[PDB]
């Protein structure tokens, strides 16, 4: 907390509850702190 906002916001959110397939999706999610990375690499298969 403190005078340390030099952290990362996003970790831990408000679980979706619009639909079932919504919630599943939300849990199986990944992030990535910030033209090449956004690509769908081969390794992604």
């Amino acid at each position: 907390q403190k005078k340390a906002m030099s952290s990362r916001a996003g970790v831990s959110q408000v679980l979706n509850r619009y639909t079932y397939s919504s919630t599943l999706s939300h849990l199986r999610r990944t992030n990535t702190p910030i033209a090449k990375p956004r690509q769908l690499h081969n390794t992604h298969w």
Binding site: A35, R38, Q39, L40, H41, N42, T43
Partner: protein, 393 residues
Amino acid sequence: LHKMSMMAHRVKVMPYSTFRLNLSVTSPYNADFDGDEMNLHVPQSEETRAELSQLCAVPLQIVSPQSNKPVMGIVQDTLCGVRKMTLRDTFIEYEQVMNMLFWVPSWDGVVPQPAILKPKPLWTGKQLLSIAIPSGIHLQRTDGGNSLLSPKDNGMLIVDGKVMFGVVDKKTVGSGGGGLIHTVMREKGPKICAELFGNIQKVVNYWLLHNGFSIGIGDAIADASTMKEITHAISSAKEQVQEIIYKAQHNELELKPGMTLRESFEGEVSRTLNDARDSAGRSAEMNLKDLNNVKQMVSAGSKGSFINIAQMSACVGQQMVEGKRIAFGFADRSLPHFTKDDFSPESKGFVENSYLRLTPQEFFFHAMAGREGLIDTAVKTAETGYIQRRLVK
């Protein structure tokens, strides 16, 4: 980003919770109805209003100064149908030729002498559609084999404000240069032309309401033998690749000045698959009769093009990122499902299949290709806006 992104409209209070705008005034704001929202502002002084109606009225805006041509034409249904209604084959009988004249508000109250009297007294779209065109409107065209008796019924000729010959579509009623609109604006004025839309509309939309129109998988299937004739235009195209690959894996080819021996290898593979794909589709294009709905929606000029048909009935195409066919992210291979050093097309991302029919590999590459697409549509989106902003300030 337009002088036209904001226009003054006549207010019409209506029920139901939504701003109801005309179709032809669609492309200026560039909206669609998939959820899009619109802002509305209300003048407040007696002049404020005037300033809004004398310079920002939608009718004054019809001819865009940026490209010295109109910027609002007839879209979708109205366009698509206006085409049908025009063909020599399109005939309408009294009962309807009447309910059609009624829908034109300016109608002089005079039914035009039937284009046919002999057995049954009929009329043709070309005739009635014309009751919408004001007197003094002279339009001349000429497409391909077009000559004062347009065989394929090409070109367009309207004299005294009556369609003489040719079919009417995007070319004759679009936000184009020769545009019957561009002309009616110039010849009659903001007002007259602005009304012209609604009419050409009202008649056509109504007509279509009754003639109906649709599309279904059936519009995307190719002739029994054509689907074969293509397959083997990919097989042969496959070997014209295996061939130049053998002839490369032997050093039996010279380096086209300025290019690497390798680069020059691609340069051909690419130019081989492309020309293959190009006719693959072209076989089906001419294989879709003058009844294929998808074709119809393409000629009218109201949606999609050759390319589209192709990727749906023939071959999807070659996938690509950064300009080169699917890379080797995995040391010397496309996917782990491949043998190393496979430079072939089935590995580098060539989807030989049609949407009507992709194989995992094809399906994947294809994704990697589209993925690049989505990328800039999500980047060039605001950097373009900056460059815009600068020019302004």
